[PDB]
Symmetry: C2
Subunit: 125 residues, 2 copies
Amino acid sequence: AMEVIREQEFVNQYHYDARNLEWEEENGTPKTNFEVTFQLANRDEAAKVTSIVAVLQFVIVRDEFVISGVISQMAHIQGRLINEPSEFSQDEVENLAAPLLEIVKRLTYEVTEIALDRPGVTLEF
Amino acid sequence: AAMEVIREQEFVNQYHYDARNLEWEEENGTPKTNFEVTFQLANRDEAAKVTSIVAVLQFVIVRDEFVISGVISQMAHIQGRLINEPSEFSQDEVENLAAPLLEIVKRLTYEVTEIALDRPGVTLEF
């Protein structure tokens, strides 16, 4: 497993929107989707560290609501020079995205618990 | 001598959290924290002495790190009153009616800023 020192997660965007069935009728029913992409920062050849920002963009559709947004985090991968994200395995992409999904999971549980006056919705992915 | 209200569950239409983008706002307009609350006659039961009212809160909260915005509604069934227009409400009646909307925005903002900034949650006082 890949060794990573991570900076503080950054919440670019988190939107909670009640579903509007009329909007959906005009623009389509939204579909739950997660996409992890990357912004390369640098390689440090001397240190053998690659710094890259991992970026999670999401739309999560449930009965009453749609949640959408983007979370990101700077990652400093130790003992690894990487030139492009096509070089990451599925496990590695999952590893780099794990803290991002967890922020989404945390925000969603708390927001839904208050908004729907119910126990918070717990996303499993 | 207070107003007797039976309320439906608060309805969160929109609650939006966006990281502050100072590049954009600088020529697109810098926002102020503000709330607007309005009240709408939904209907009546004048035999039962009841006015049903929709309270709607629209809000923007600006801090260094973020803009939060959205719209919260609640249905309120006012007992023992037959209101013809919303301006009949007194300041304390409006305060009463708006309070649960503001408390929702307060709770949402605390949990979200607590998680987003990882730093003690922002506690709004209106």
